[PDB]
């Protein structure tokens, strides 16, 4: 059929010219049924029309088309567990988005897409309903009603085929969980494919570290209950026999380093094959080759297994690549943090030969900073150069500020509140300013700190701190005296070995003491400072100013922060007042902890702790009584009331503040007291020595699935505190408090774990060696960690 004119009916958005271009048929050409059908199909596939009708009028070809309504808005109802923004992103990725057209036959497709999304996120019984609301100007609104349903949780993770290790032990290390006790923090009880793959790899590594070279996971099954509210996981495996490591050989283009590589592959004949040690050997060879300028030193291991004698003989293939030189390290995404803040964390240096391990170390350090959500690396080859690269780091930044408010409890300190506001990246400069405050049964502390972590490019820090500290002694099981102090501080820090960290600094502290109960201990010290207060009343006051020089040293070799199982921590601290200050004394403290695992799985451990301290005056004075050493409590010697070990007060005969019967008074004047008066409330001494031997054992009565999250210990603590300046000649009747041979011991049990309320620790100790005055407290506990 010859065509002389072209017309359309219903075109609103699509232009006439664009439509004419779309249709292969053009004005002035023959048209048949095939051409009309092809044009109709083309219009249908364009997506802008729902119904297409092409009919021939008397002379012209009239086209009747119903344009699909345009989408105006989208609404959601019932997406409780799904964020609206990400759901909208999923919809737009699927194809449906604002501005485009809506088909009246693709509603089922969108429904099934959303159903697939919900099946992915966890809800296997979710339902979705689409409602279409027409509106004038050929518009349409698409509403979605969601019935999320009940999420499916794991009911069992089973392993069949394991004869050497019980199922609970293997499942203990998995990320996926089937038992989540209320009193413990192990994790959620959901299911995700990535978690399952990671856990299969974890199981493979668990077996391969024991010598089961022929290990093989036959197949994994995931099943749902008919109601789709529970998931059952099974892992059919097959474990071979333990294999010994006969020897290792290295072959390839080592680049003339066989002498220094063959040393790295030495193994005692008869060692049990291992999967971690072989990986470490490969990593060590890679590091040795990369220390020589190589960027990608490929290393592979292909064990040869001999089942006749059960021997594994490795075959390491080493292909040392060729040097690549960095030319630009580019950081993008650091819109707030200055360039130097990101660049000073780099181990890779621009203008130097490339090293993959160095790049990974830089990425790990940037992650450890804590200012970035995600830190990605990309090595882009420079065009026109065969051995030059540019390393690009792409960082997504967080809002690093923080408010925080915590609450804790414990017998040692009572209810303890903490509040704080911190900024770790002040104006993106790297300074970490903060304000903190704590308040427990016997003090109130408030500090303002400002730390520069890279005062010198090497890593030397420089921190300052104002602090106000109010200390009520009577509420801490000591003699009555209130001490309100305030001061500044500035401290450097020199990291020297990645474990040792020296630190020296100055400080100024002003102490105002008031409401001091008469006794021998202080008025042996007040007389030194020239004060001559009256011992018949407790309306006293004493203000002192000190310019101290604080030095220290640390050594933190512990492998794990929480429940360490091997290493040793040491911490030396000191203090000395430089001339010009009112006081003149020197103080030294030394804390130590040492873990010595006594097996291969690090389940039975021995922990030895010590805490030593000594301080005394210099210019004929004494150490202030508000800096003494207190021993006994939930941390130092378990089983003794907090701050009870050591010398006891010897009160003078004094008139009380407001005497009234039925209230216990420390033998005041209105009770017939006419001489020095003993007491049973500790004062602390100026010399401290405490030790503790602890045996950490597996929890006996807890299911092995989560028995590694509870630490059980049998401990034996011992300690003593003595006052060196006490003169035994004058006070002969009273006990000799300057004698260090008075040792206090206490043995008992201790449990520790993490509950949703915080780190819980409980302890029951039975002091079997205590002296007159000491107050025992069998059961102690701490909850929440302030």
């Amino acid at each position: 059929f010859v065509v002389k004119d072209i017309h359309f009916e219903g075109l609103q958005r699509v232009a006439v010219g664009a439509a004419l271009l779309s249709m292969p048929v053009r004005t002035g050409d023959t048209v048949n049924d095939e051409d009309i059908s092809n044009t109709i199909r083309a219009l249908f596939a364009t997506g802008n029309f729902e119904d297409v009708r092409v009919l021939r009028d008397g002379d012209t070809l009239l086209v009747q088309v119903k344009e699909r309504p345009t989408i105006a808005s989208i609404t959601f109802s019932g997406n409780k567990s799904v964020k609206d923004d990400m759901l909208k992103q999923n919809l737009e990725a699927s194809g449906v988005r604002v501005g485009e057209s809506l088909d009246r036959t693709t509603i089922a497709d969108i429904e099934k897409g959303l159903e697939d999304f919900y099946y992915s996120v966890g809800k296997y019984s979710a339902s979705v309903k689409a409602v279409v609301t027409p509106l004038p100007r050929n518009r349409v609104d698409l509403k979605l009603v969601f019935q999320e349903g009940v999420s499916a949780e794991i009911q069992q993770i089973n392993i069949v085929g394991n004869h050497a290790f019980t199922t609970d032990e293997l499942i203990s290390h998995f990320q996926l969980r089937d038992e989540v006790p209320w009193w413990n923090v192990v994790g959620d009880r959901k299911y995700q494919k990535q978690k399952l793959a990671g856990d299969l790899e974890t199981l493979r590594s668990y077996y391969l570290d024991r010598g089961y070279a022929r290990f093989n996971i036959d197949s994994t099954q995931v099943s749902l209950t008919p109601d789709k509210k529970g998931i059952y996981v099974t892992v059919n495996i097959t474990e071979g026999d333990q294999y010994k490591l006969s020897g290792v050989e290295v072959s390839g283009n080592l680049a003339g380093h066989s002498a220094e590589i063959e040393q790295l592959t030495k193994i005692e004949p008869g060692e049990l094959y291992n999967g971690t040690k072989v990986t470490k050997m490969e990593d060590d060879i890679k590091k040795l080759l990369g220390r020589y300028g190589y960027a990608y030193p490929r290393v592979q291991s292909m064990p040869e297994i001999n089942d006749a004698d059960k021997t594994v003989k490795l075959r390491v293939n080493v292909d040392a690549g060729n040097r690549f030189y960095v030319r630009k390290i580019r950081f993008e995404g650091n819109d707030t943090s200055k360039d130097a803040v990101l660049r000073r964390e780099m181990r890779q240096m621009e203008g130097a030969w490339l090293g993959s391990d160095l790049v990974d170390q830089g990425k790990e350090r940037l992650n450890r900073l804590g200012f970035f959500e995600t830190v990605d690396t990309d090595t882009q080859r420079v065009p026109g150069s065969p051995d030059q690269v540019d390393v690009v780091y792409k960082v997504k930044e967080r809002n690093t500020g923080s408010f925080n408010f915590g609450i804790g409890y414990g017998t040692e300190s009572g209810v303890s509140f903490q509040a704080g506001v911190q900024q770790d990246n002040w104006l993106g400069t790297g300074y970490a300013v903060g304000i903190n405050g704590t308040k427990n049964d016997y003090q109130t502390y408030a500090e303002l700190s400002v730390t520069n972590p890279y005062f010198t490019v090497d890593g030397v820090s420089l921190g300052g701190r104002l602090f106000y500290n109010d200390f009520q002694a009577d509420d801490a099981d000591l003699s009555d005296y209130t001490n309100k102090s305030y001061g500044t501080d500035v401290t450097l820090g020199f990291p020297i070995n990645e474990y040792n960290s020296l630190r020296a600094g100055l400080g100024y502290v002003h102490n105002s003491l008031s409401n001091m109960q008469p006794q021998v201990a202080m008025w042996r010290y007040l007389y030194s400072m020239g004060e001559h207060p009256s011992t018949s009343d407790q309306d006293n006051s004493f203000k002192t100013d000190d310019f101290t020089f604080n030095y220290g040293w640390t050594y933190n070799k512990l492998d794990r922060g929480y429940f360490p199982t091997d290493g040793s921590r040491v911490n030396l601290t000191g203090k000395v007042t430089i001339p010009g200050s009112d006081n003149e004394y020197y103080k030294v403290t030394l804390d130590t902890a040492t873990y010595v695992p006594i097996d291969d799985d690090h389940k039975w451990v021995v922990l030895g702790r010590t805490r030593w301290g000594y301080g005394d005056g210099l210019g004929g004075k004494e150490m202030p009584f508000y800096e003494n050493f207190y021993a006994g409590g939930s941390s130092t010697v378990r089983g003794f009331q907090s701050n009870t070990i050591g010398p006891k007060a010897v009160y003078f005969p004094h008139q009380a503040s407001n005497y009234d019967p039925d209230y216990d008074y420390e033998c005041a004047t209105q009770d017939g007291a006419k001489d020095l008066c003993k007491s049973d409330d500790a004062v602390g001494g100026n010399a401290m020595a405490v030790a503790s031997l602890e045996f950490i054992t597996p929890t006996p009565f807890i299911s092995d699935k989560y028995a590694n999250s509870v630490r059980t210990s049998f401990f034996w603590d011992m300690g003593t505190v003595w006052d060196t300046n006490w003169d035994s000649s004058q006070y002969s009747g009273y006990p000799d408090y300057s004698d260090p041979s008075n040792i206090r011991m206490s043995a008992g049990i201790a449990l520790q774990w993490m509950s949703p309320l915080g780190p819980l620790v409980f302890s029951y100790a039975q002091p079997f060696k205590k002296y007159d005055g000491d107050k025992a407290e069998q059961f102690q506990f701490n909850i929440g960690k302030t």
């Binding site: 809002n399 923080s402 408010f403 925080n404 408010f405 915590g406 609450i407 804790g408 903490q418 960690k785």
Partner: peptide, 7 residues
């Protein structure tokens, strides 16, 4: 316990 809410 210790809650920690970012700015």
């Amino acid at each position: 316990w210790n809650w920690s809410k970012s700015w």
